Amino acid sequence: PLNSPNVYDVTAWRIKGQPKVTAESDIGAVINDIIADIKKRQSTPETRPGAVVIIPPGDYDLHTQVVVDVDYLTIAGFGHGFFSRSIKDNVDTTGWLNLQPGGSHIRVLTPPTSPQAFLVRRDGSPRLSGIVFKDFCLDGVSFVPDGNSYKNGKTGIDVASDNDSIHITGMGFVYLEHALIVRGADALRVHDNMVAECGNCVELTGAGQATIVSDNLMGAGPEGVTLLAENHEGLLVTGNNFFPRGRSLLEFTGCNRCSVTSNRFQGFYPGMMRLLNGCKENLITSNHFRRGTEGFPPFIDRTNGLDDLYGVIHAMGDNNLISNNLFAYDVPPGKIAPAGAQPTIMLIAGGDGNVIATNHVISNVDTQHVVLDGSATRSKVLDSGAASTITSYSPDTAIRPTP
Amino acid sequence: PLNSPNVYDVTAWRIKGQPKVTAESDIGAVINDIIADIKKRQSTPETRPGAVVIIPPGDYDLHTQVVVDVDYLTIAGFGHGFFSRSIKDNVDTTGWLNLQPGGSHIRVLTPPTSPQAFLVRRDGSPRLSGIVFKDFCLDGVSFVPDGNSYKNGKTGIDVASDNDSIHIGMGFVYLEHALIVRGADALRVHDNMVAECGNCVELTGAGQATIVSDNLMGAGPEGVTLLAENHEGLLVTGNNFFPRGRSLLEFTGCNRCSVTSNRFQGFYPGMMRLLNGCKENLITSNHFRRGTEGFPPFIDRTNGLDDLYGVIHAMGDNNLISNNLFAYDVPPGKIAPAGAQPTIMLIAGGDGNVIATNHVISNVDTQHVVLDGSATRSKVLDSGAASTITSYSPDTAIRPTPH
Amino acid sequence: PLNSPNVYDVTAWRIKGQPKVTAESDIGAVINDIIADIKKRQSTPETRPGAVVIIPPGDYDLHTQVVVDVDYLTIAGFGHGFFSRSIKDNVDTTGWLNLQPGGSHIRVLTPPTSPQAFLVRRDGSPRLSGIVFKDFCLDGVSFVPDGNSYKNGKTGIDVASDNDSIHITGMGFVYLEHALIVRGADALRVHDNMVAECGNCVELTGAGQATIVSDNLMGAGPEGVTLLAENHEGLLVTGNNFFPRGRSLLEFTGCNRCSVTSNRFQGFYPGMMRLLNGCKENLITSNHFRRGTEGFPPFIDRTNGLDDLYGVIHAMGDNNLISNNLFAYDVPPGKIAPAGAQPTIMLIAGGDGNVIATNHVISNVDTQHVVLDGSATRSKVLDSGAASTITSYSPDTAIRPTPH
């Protein structure tokens, strides 16, 4: 296709000895064969510039787990191919012109023994660098045992070893239990993707730093996360549009000095944002939060199991600034739990020196804009509601009511 | 090109029965013929993954409107090719090395009966999904009756039916309407150059869960830069809005949306309009600059609004307008009515709007905020000294900027 | 590869009469010959749509400076190929499976007297328009005399003429003294790039308008800038993650009516952000600032020459709004300069009408959240610390303490 051994077209690659296997049959086995070819040619630490694997638009089955263990591997298609399998599964489709995702369309059919479509892992060293996934579709085909479970044991991309300067962009993920997982992320960018109708959308696990999650459209399932970060430092989460049915939309555990800023958050349950297990010195600012109620009939009676005293924002940790946010809460009275409670918008569950400033709350019922747990210390609440709307069980909270 | 029938090169495709038609002579006829080939091969609701149409850099005339009615079509070039025709049309170009836009350059020469270059439409189910336009240039060639009218009846891309996960690296120039998307769900309009058009981006009818991000945009004095009708959860962030639209951001009946971290430069009153009951929107962390036209051919153009209309004009409930900077500089003899103090933020009506932490700087005496008599339960916090706030409403809570 | 004369594969292009000159041996000379072919074909001011130059993944040496003087030239690879040469040069690399950057990998080996790999310049009119650099790696290979100097005299991309609608995206820059320089920027976008372990990262010089710098990862060296802008108006700097070792992370000089919002800033020296020489009417809001100390042993004693009284933010100009930021200051007492000083977080060094509002500061030692110079006039400080954390040497500053 190009005059380089480092450019591969998956529809043109034949695996010698398995002349049966096509990119349609098992694009997994095809990409694994490509990667073996790269290793044969790229032999030394001075000759390993990587390669591009090109996925033309089409339907491709993947049976065999692709193991990605080379730097600067770009896997690229020509479109994210997103399609709502969740609407398809739940309505009459008589006369429908289309019934599945497309674009550069990888149907993930991995075994239980090898559940992730792409396993990005190198046990040797150094860290994997500069790997790029872009412009293709990873589709888990269905949920198990029905369409509404958000469970199938499949993962789209799982980066399992420490990594630097990975770039995930223009992707589509649908109907995977775990769309994207990146462990030990440094200088990662998850940018401008469509990640929806998955049990879990983006999991940033183990630890990480210097990461940006931006301009993504994301919606998860009621037992899974939308964005999760574990032990991140200096994570920037910005310009994202989070919607749907995750148990949460943003979940940080032990994340410090991160910024969640200029996003849009729409959820149907308490606990849309959870700053857990000692999250400190984070900026939570200039976001729009919408707490509403499930409208799609097949999901009306399912919840994430939390009540409305949990908080739209639930914070456990130190010295966070939660400021300059709009919260719009609208839940039918008969749907609030426990029955008769005032919902809590921001709950400070514990921690020292949190500052809550210039937040505007609107709710259909009486709400506590802020509740501070009895264990909260040295808190400030400025202009986030009248005195009526701020409950401190802690004796030491400084409160300026909104004029 | 690749080993897939789902990858098309426009410069290589020949129309059976019309051998002389080329991509140069009528790229529209070529793409239509490509699209028919796709529809011929992709015959069933389970075998429609879509395709890519690639547009090499070059000059291409479009005479026939392209109708896009297949999911997961990608039309991609290699450059947005933007060129200032407006400067060209108004100055001495003696010795100019280039006179028109380029890149993957489509000159839009449609008939007045089907004036949209790309018409994105399906009668039938389901919604059109996952269409991509990227990295090419749509050029309306000239304005009539002359180069400064911003009128030619041409549209770049017009998405006419309800749609999901559409993704628009483009350049648009000298079109009366650059991009229109009706019934957007999970649309991304990202990192485009959309300038010297009558109107730039119109998101019409209704929509949800859309992101407009990282765009450069400038319109004309009778048109809109960004418009949204009846959107919920629209996120507008990272954009640099400049030029000469009647307005820069225009919402009508949009609720629970967020406009954050943009730059806004305009030359007339009414740069931002939140109209006909916009509620619970976040308008924050933006820079507004109101200046005066400096390009002679447009020195006498206005949008018909006086300086009492507001830099922001808002009619609706419970919006938070906070952490913005407003820098107003217009010569005394260009302010209307003569002798009036310009208004920076006008709350035209609505309940429970909160104006917080805004810095205004102006060359003349201005009212930072004027609240209409009809506004109820408004708050104005730290957005000017007392002498810069006018509330004709009797129940506005005001905290002057100290001193 | 496609049926158009405007698409070039650098690996397929033969320079007629120079069979030895390849993309591998000198991709600079290859690209210049491609440029010559474009000009040969694209011969009138109505027949210049430009071209795309495609760079497959591989290792390519550049010895000859590429001079870009045609509109709508796209140079495109498949991969930004970033690799930490700085870590490589400083630790034990036994058994390391890779020792250099990759992707679409251009090794910059320019002569001392034409240092820039790409020179984007046109004498004449109009302004160069619509040029696109994307998805490739520019790698200056080494710093001299050792890998830790951040010095080699090399530049990745230097745009020297006034320009319109240039787009730089998906790039990797590494080990260059200057990664990217753009003079006379109008409607520039520097978007979603990796610009690290360079002496300087992005310099927007001369003057400029209506530019966006967004969604980048950037880290510079102790003598250079990360992002610099000179005399820009309406620059928007957003969604970036600034880290590392630049003398500063954001440096404006004479910039007006610009906006810096929703970024992350991590630095190891004072002066992380500098609004210098009469910056007016700028918005600095919704940012996260971390001032820390160096943790990588080879650089422990490197300084940028400033003390902790200079400020995390240093501002000289009028009517800036510095609001809704978080500053997390952690520097061991033995590392603070001058010894025993209270560090300053935000310093208003001069100017009229500046407004500091709703800022949260956490520091390991006592700090002054805001210090205002004696010459500052009409300043406001709101909710950016207790009274004891605000110092105004100007007598006209209005101060509201953070309550309690």
PDB file of N, CA and C in Angstrom, chain B residues 260-320:
ATOM      1  N   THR B 260     -18.495  27.048  28.581  1.00  0.00           N
ATOM      2  CA  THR B 260     -17.387  27.185  29.522  1.00  0.00           C
ATOM      3  C   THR B 260     -16.045  27.182  28.787  1.00  0.00           C
ATOM      4  N   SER B 261     -15.161  28.110  29.175  1.00  0.00           N
ATOM      5  CA  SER B 261     -13.779  28.128  28.689  1.00  0.00           C
ATOM      6  C   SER B 261     -13.713  28.352  27.182  1.00  0.00           C
ATOM      7  N   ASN B 262     -14.472  29.344  26.722  1.00  0.00           N
ATOM      8  CA  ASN B 262     -14.360  29.873  25.380  1.00  0.00           C
ATOM      9  C   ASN B 262     -13.771  31.294  25.375  1.00  0.00           C
ATOM     10  N   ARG B 263     -13.270  31.717  24.215  1.00  0.00           N
ATOM     11  CA  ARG B 263     -13.065  33.127  23.929  1.00  0.00           C
ATOM     12  C   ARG B 263     -14.092  33.709  22.923  1.00  0.00           C
ATOM     13  N   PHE B 264     -14.634  34.885  23.241  1.00  0.00           N
ATOM     14  CA  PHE B 264     -15.680  35.533  22.440  1.00  0.00           C
ATOM     15  C   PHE B 264     -15.242  36.956  22.080  1.00  0.00           C
ATOM     16  N   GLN B 265     -15.027  37.211  20.787  1.00  0.00           N
ATOM     17  CA  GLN B 265     -14.765  38.567  20.292  1.00  0.00           C
ATOM     18  C   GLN B 265     -15.780  38.979  19.240  1.00  0.00           C
ATOM     19  N   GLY B 266     -16.487  40.070  19.501  1.00  0.00           N
ATOM     20  CA  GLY B 266     -17.512  40.557  18.573  1.00  0.00           C
ATOM     21  C   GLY B 266     -17.520  42.072  18.498  1.00  0.00           C
ATOM     22  N   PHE B 267     -18.283  42.606  17.549  1.00  0.00           N
ATOM     23  CA  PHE B 267     -18.168  44.004  17.117  1.00  0.00           C
ATOM     24  C   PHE B 267     -19.544  44.678  17.251  1.00  0.00           C
ATOM     25  N   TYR B 268     -20.553  43.919  17.687  1.00  0.00           N
ATOM     26  CA  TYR B 268     -21.911  44.434  17.888  1.00  0.00           C
ATOM     27  C   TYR B 268     -22.419  43.993  19.237  1.00  0.00           C
ATOM     28  N   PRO B 269     -23.480  44.643  19.731  1.00  0.00           N
ATOM     29  CA  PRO B 269     -24.210  44.140  20.914  1.00  0.00           C
ATOM     30  C   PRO B 269     -24.847  42.771  20.655  1.00  0.00           C
ATOM     31  N   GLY B 270     -25.164  42.033  21.728  1.00  0.00           N
ATOM     32  CA  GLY B 270     -25.860  40.735  21.624  1.00  0.00           C
ATOM     33  C   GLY B 270     -24.936  39.604  21.187  1.00  0.00           C
ATOM     34  N   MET B 271     -23.684  39.615  21.650  1.00  0.00           N
ATOM     35  CA  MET B 271     -22.746  38.555  21.263  1.00  0.00           C
ATOM     36  C   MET B 271     -23.221  37.176  21.756  1.00  0.00           C
ATOM     37  N   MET B 272     -23.826  37.155  22.944  1.00  0.00           N
ATOM     38  CA  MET B 272     -24.412  35.944  23.502  1.00  0.00           C
ATOM     39  C   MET B 272     -25.883  36.188  23.813  1.00  0.00           C
ATOM     40  N   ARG B 273     -26.747  35.335  23.287  1.00  0.00           N
ATOM     41  CA  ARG B 273     -28.182  35.478  23.508  1.00  0.00           C
ATOM     42  C   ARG B 273     -28.740  34.171  24.029  1.00  0.00           C
ATOM     43  N   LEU B 274     -29.286  34.199  25.236  1.00  0.00           N
ATOM     44  CA  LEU B 274     -30.002  33.044  25.764  1.00  0.00           C
ATOM     45  C   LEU B 274     -31.481  33.377  25.768  1.00  0.00           C
ATOM     46  N   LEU B 275     -32.219  32.789  24.825  1.00  0.00           N
ATOM     47  CA  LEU B 275     -33.517  33.327  24.395  1.00  0.00           C
ATOM     48  C   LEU B 275     -34.664  32.350  24.635  1.00  0.00           C
ATOM     49  N   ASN B 276     -35.835  32.935  24.871  1.00  0.00           N
ATOM     50  CA  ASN B 276     -37.114  32.217  24.983  1.00  0.00           C
ATOM     51  C   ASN B 276     -37.189  31.146  26.052  1.00  0.00           C
ATOM     52  N   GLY B 277     -36.716  31.449  27.261  1.00  0.00           N
ATOM     53  CA  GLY B 277     -36.793  30.524  28.387  1.00  0.00           C
ATOM     54  C   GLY B 277     -35.669  29.494  28.477  1.00  0.00           C
ATOM     55  N   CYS B 278     -34.425  29.917  28.301  1.00  0.00           N
ATOM     56  CA  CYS B 278     -33.287  29.052  28.591  1.00  0.00           C
ATOM     57  C   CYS B 278     -33.101  28.918  30.103  1.00  0.00           C
ATOM     58  N   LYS B 279     -33.210  27.711  30.650  1.00  0.00           N
ATOM     59  CA  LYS B 279     -32.985  27.593  32.091  1.00  0.00           C
ATOM     60  C   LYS B 279     -31.877  26.671  32.575  1.00  0.00           C
ATOM     61  N   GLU B 280     -31.324  26.987  33.742  1.00  0.00           N
ATOM     62  CA  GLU B 280     -30.368  26.110  34.420  1.00  0.00           C
ATOM     63  C   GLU B 280     -29.149  25.801  33.542  1.00  0.00           C
ATOM     64  N   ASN B 281     -28.664  26.838  32.856  1.00  0.00           N
ATOM     65  CA  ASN B 281     -27.456  26.755  32.043  1.00  0.00           C
ATOM     66  C   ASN B 281     -26.277  27.350  32.807  1.00  0.00           C
ATOM     67  N   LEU B 282     -25.094  26.770  32.597  1.00  0.00           N
ATOM     68  CA  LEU B 282     -23.867  27.296  33.163  1.00  0.00           C
ATOM     69  C   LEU B 282     -23.094  28.082  32.091  1.00  0.00           C
ATOM     70  N   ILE B 283     -22.837  29.352  32.394  1.00  0.00           N
ATOM     71  CA  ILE B 283     -22.151  30.254  31.486  1.00  0.00           C
ATOM     72  C   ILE B 283     -20.972  30.803  32.268  1.00  0.00           C
ATOM     73  N   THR B 284     -19.795  30.223  32.059  1.00  0.00           N
ATOM     74  CA  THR B 284     -18.713  30.410  33.013  1.00  0.00           C
ATOM     75  C   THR B 284     -17.330  30.311  32.396  1.00  0.00           C
ATOM     76  N   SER B 285     -16.380  31.053  32.971  1.00  0.00           N
ATOM     77  CA  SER B 285     -14.966  30.922  32.624  1.00  0.00           C
ATOM     78  C   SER B 285     -14.752  31.260  31.156  1.00  0.00           C
ATOM     79  N   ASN B 286     -15.510  32.238  30.679  1.00  0.00           N
ATOM     80  CA  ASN B 286     -15.386  32.702  29.292  1.00  0.00           C
ATOM     81  C   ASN B 286     -14.794  34.098  29.258  1.00  0.00           C
ATOM     82  N   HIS B 287     -14.109  34.415  28.160  1.00  0.00           N
ATOM     83  CA  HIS B 287     -13.649  35.776  27.920  1.00  0.00           C
ATOM     84  C   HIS B 287     -14.480  36.438  26.850  1.00  0.00           C
ATOM     85  N   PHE B 288     -15.112  37.558  27.192  1.00  0.00           N
ATOM     86  CA  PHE B 288     -15.885  38.359  26.240  1.00  0.00           C
ATOM     87  C   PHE B 288     -15.179  39.676  25.936  1.00  0.00           C
ATOM     88  N   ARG B 289     -15.026  39.935  24.661  1.00  0.00           N
ATOM     89  CA  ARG B 289     -14.464  41.194  24.215  1.00  0.00           C
ATOM     90  C   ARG B 289     -15.409  41.868  23.213  1.00  0.00           C
ATOM     91  N   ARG B 290     -15.953  43.008  23.585  1.00  0.00           N
ATOM     92  CA  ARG B 290     -16.773  43.800  22.678  1.00  0.00           C
ATOM     93  C   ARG B 290     -15.950  44.971  22.139  1.00  0.00           C
ATOM     94  N   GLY B 291     -15.698  44.938  20.836  1.00  0.00           N
ATOM     95  CA  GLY B 291     -14.879  45.966  20.196  1.00  0.00           C
ATOM     96  C   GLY B 291     -15.639  46.637  19.065  1.00  0.00           C
ATOM     97  N   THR B 292     -14.898  47.235  18.146  1.00  0.00           N
ATOM     98  CA  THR B 292     -15.504  47.982  17.045  1.00  0.00           C
ATOM     99  C   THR B 292     -14.875  47.519  15.731  1.00  0.00           C
ATOM    100  N   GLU B 293     -15.670  47.431  14.667  1.00  0.00           N
ATOM    101  CA  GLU B 293     -15.154  46.976  13.373  1.00  0.00           C
ATOM    102  C   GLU B 293     -13.936  47.785  12.915  1.00  0.00           C
ATOM    103  N   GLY B 294     -12.867  47.119  12.495  1.00  0.00           N
ATOM    104  CA  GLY B 294     -11.682  47.821  12.006  1.00  0.00           C
ATOM    105  C   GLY B 294     -11.374  47.615  10.529  1.00  0.00           C
ATOM    106  N   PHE B 295     -12.195  46.831   9.833  1.00  0.00           N
ATOM    107  CA  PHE B 295     -11.973  46.556   8.409  1.00  0.00           C
ATOM    108  C   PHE B 295     -12.940  47.398   7.564  1.00  0.00           C
ATOM    109  N   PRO B 296     -12.413  48.425   6.860  1.00  0.00           N
ATOM    110  CA  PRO B 296     -13.190  49.443   6.159  1.00  0.00           C
ATOM    111  C   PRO B 296     -14.464  48.979   5.439  1.00  0.00           C
ATOM    112  N   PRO B 297     -14.410  47.896   4.632  1.00  0.00           N
ATOM    113  CA  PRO B 297     -15.638  47.533   3.908  1.00  0.00           C
ATOM    114  C   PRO B 297     -16.829  47.235   4.823  1.00  0.00           C
ATOM    115  N   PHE B 298     -16.568  46.968   6.101  1.00  0.00           N
ATOM    116  CA  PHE B 298     -17.642  46.638   7.039  1.00  0.00           C
ATOM    117  C   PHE B 298     -17.900  47.692   8.131  1.00  0.00           C
ATOM    118  N   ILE B 299     -17.163  48.811   8.104  1.00  0.00           N
ATOM    119  CA  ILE B 299     -17.324  49.888   9.104  1.00  0.00           C
ATOM    120  C   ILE B 299     -18.758  50.356   9.316  1.00  0.00           C
ATOM    121  N   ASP B 300     -19.608  50.265   8.312  1.00  0.00           N
ATOM    122  CA  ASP B 300     -20.957  50.716   8.567  1.00  0.00           C
ATOM    123  C   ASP B 300     -21.988  49.627   8.797  1.00  0.00           C
ATOM    124  N   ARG B 301     -21.545  48.377   8.874  1.00  0.00           N
ATOM    125  CA  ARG B 301     -22.469  47.274   9.115  1.00  0.00           C
ATOM    126  C   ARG B 301     -22.831  47.183  10.604  1.00  0.00           C
ATOM    127  N   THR B 302     -24.097  46.907  10.898  1.00  0.00           N
ATOM    128  CA  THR B 302     -24.509  46.619  12.269  1.00  0.00           C
ATOM    129  C   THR B 302     -25.479  45.454  12.233  1.00  0.00           C
ATOM    130  N   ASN B 303     -25.894  44.980  13.401  1.00  0.00           N
ATOM    131  CA  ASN B 303     -26.814  43.864  13.467  1.00  0.00           C
ATOM    132  C   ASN B 303     -28.160  44.370  13.958  1.00  0.00           C
ATOM    133  N   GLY B 304     -28.301  45.693  14.069  1.00  0.00           N
ATOM    134  CA  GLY B 304     -29.603  46.297  14.342  1.00  0.00           C
ATOM    135  C   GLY B 304     -29.937  46.396  15.819  1.00  0.00           C
ATOM    136  N   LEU B 305     -28.950  46.125  16.675  1.00  0.00           N
ATOM    137  CA  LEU B 305     -29.186  46.110  18.113  1.00  0.00           C
ATOM    138  C   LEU B 305     -28.407  47.237  18.756  1.00  0.00           C
ATOM    139  N   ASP B 306     -28.987  47.870  19.775  1.00  0.00           N
ATOM    140  CA  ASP B 306     -28.259  48.911  20.487  1.00  0.00           C
ATOM    141  C   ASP B 306     -27.484  48.401  21.719  1.00  0.00           C
ATOM    142  N   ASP B 307     -26.672  49.274  22.289  1.00  0.00           N
ATOM    143  CA  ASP B 307     -25.808  48.907  23.401  1.00  0.00           C
ATOM    144  C   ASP B 307     -26.528  48.652  24.723  1.00  0.00           C
ATOM    145  N   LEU B 308     -27.845  48.860  24.743  1.00  0.00           N
ATOM    146  CA  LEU B 308     -28.659  48.444  25.891  1.00  0.00           C
ATOM    147  C   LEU B 308     -29.109  46.994  25.806  1.00  0.00           C
ATOM    148  N   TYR B 309     -28.841  46.328  24.692  1.00  0.00           N
ATOM    149  CA  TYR B 309     -29.286  44.942  24.543  1.00  0.00           C
ATOM    150  C   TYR B 309     -28.464  43.983  25.429  1.00  0.00           C
ATOM    151  N   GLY B 310     -27.211  44.345  25.692  1.00  0.00           N
ATOM    152  CA  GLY B 310     -26.306  43.498  26.491  1.00  0.00           C
ATOM    153  C   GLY B 310     -25.256  42.765  25.668  1.00  0.00           C
ATOM    154  N   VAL B 311     -24.070  42.569  26.253  1.00  0.00           N
ATOM    155  CA  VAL B 311     -23.087  41.655  25.680  1.00  0.00           C
ATOM    156  C   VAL B 311     -23.632  40.226  25.801  1.00  0.00           C
ATOM    157  N   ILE B 312     -24.184  39.916  26.979  1.00  0.00           N
ATOM    158  CA  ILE B 312     -25.030  38.745  27.196  1.00  0.00           C
ATOM    159  C   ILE B 312     -26.472  39.220  27.411  1.00  0.00           C
ATOM    160  N   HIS B 313     -27.414  38.631  26.683  1.00  0.00           N
ATOM    161  CA  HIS B 313     -28.834  38.908  26.875  1.00  0.00           C
ATOM    162  C   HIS B 313     -29.510  37.607  27.232  1.00  0.00           C
ATOM    163  N   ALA B 314     -30.053  37.531  28.452  1.00  0.00           N
ATOM    164  CA  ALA B 314     -30.590  36.266  28.995  1.00  0.00           C
ATOM    165  C   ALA B 314     -32.049  36.397  29.428  1.00  0.00           C
ATOM    166  N   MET B 315     -32.867  35.465  28.938  1.00  0.00           N
ATOM    167  CA  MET B 315     -34.281  35.319  29.310  1.00  0.00           C
ATOM    168  C   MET B 315     -34.566  33.849  29.695  1.00  0.00           C
ATOM    169  N   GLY B 316     -34.587  33.579  30.999  1.00  0.00           N
ATOM    170  CA  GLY B 316     -34.924  32.249  31.519  1.00  0.00           C
ATOM    171  C   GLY B 316     -34.518  32.124  32.975  1.00  0.00           C
ATOM    172  N   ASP B 317     -34.676  30.934  33.541  1.00  0.00           N
ATOM    173  CA  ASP B 317     -34.531  30.744  34.987  1.00  0.00           C
ATOM    174  C   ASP B 317     -33.212  30.103  35.389  1.00  0.00           C
ATOM    175  N   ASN B 318     -32.658  30.548  36.516  1.00  0.00           N
ATOM    176  CA  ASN B 318     -31.699  29.749  37.279  1.00  0.00           C
ATOM    177  C   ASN B 318     -30.453  29.409  36.495  1.00  0.00           C
ATOM    178  N   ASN B 319     -30.036  30.321  35.623  1.00  0.00           N
ATOM    179  CA  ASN B 319     -28.708  30.224  35.008  1.00  0.00           C
ATOM    180  C   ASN B 319     -27.641  30.775  35.958  1.00  0.00           C
ATOM    181  N   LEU B 320     -26.446  30.196  35.903  1.00  0.00           N
ATOM    182  CA  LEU B 320     -25.310  30.720  36.659  1.00  0.00           C
ATOM    183  C   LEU B 320     -24.323  31.364  35.694  1.00  0.00           C
TER     184      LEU B 320
END
